[PDB]
Amino acid sequence: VNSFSGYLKLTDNVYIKNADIVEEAKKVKPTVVVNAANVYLKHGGGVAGALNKATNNAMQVESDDYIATNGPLKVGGSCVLSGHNLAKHCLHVVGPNVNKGEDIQLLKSAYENFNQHEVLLAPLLSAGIFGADPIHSLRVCVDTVRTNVYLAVFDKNLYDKLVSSFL
C-alpha cells in the first residue's frame, strides 16, 4: 500500500492521473520523482523548468555542480540527485527530443532507467516540448517499465485521449 490517490490502473504496474507533477510531488513526497531532463541538466521549461522552479532553483544549482564534475548525460541515460522539497530523490531521465532530431528508439532505453526504482512518480518521457507522441510514450512505458510507475499528465484533454485510446 502506498499514498498515491486517484489514479486509473492501466496494467499490473502502470497507473495514470490528470495532475500537475509539481503539486503531486509536493503532496505525496514520493521516494522518487522523475524529471524530464536534457543532457546538460538545464531545467528551463516543460516539466524540468516547473520542478526546478518549485525547488527555488536548488535543483539547478545541484545540477550545475553535477555537470561540472561528470559532464553531460547520454540521451537515454539518467542520474539520481536530490529530490529537494519535492521527493527524497529526483531521477533525471533524458528521453530523446524530437525537436532536436534524436532517435525515438532511445525512448525505450530512457524508460529502462525506471526499473532501478521500485516506485516512481513520473511524466511521460519525450512528451510535451520534447516533441514525441504521448500515446507512443505511454505504450513504450507500459511495455518497458516493470516497477510501479505513477504517471502524471498535466493536460486534462491529453489525459482523456491516452485513457480512451489505451490498448
Ligand SMILES: NC(=O)c1c[nH]c2ncnc(N[C@H]3CCCC=C3Br)c12
Ligand atoms: N511545464 C510542463 O510541461 C509541465 C509541468 N508539470 C507537468 N506535468 C506533466 N507534464 C508536463 N508537461 C508535458 C510533458 C509530458 C507530456 C504531457 C505534458 Br502536459 C508538465
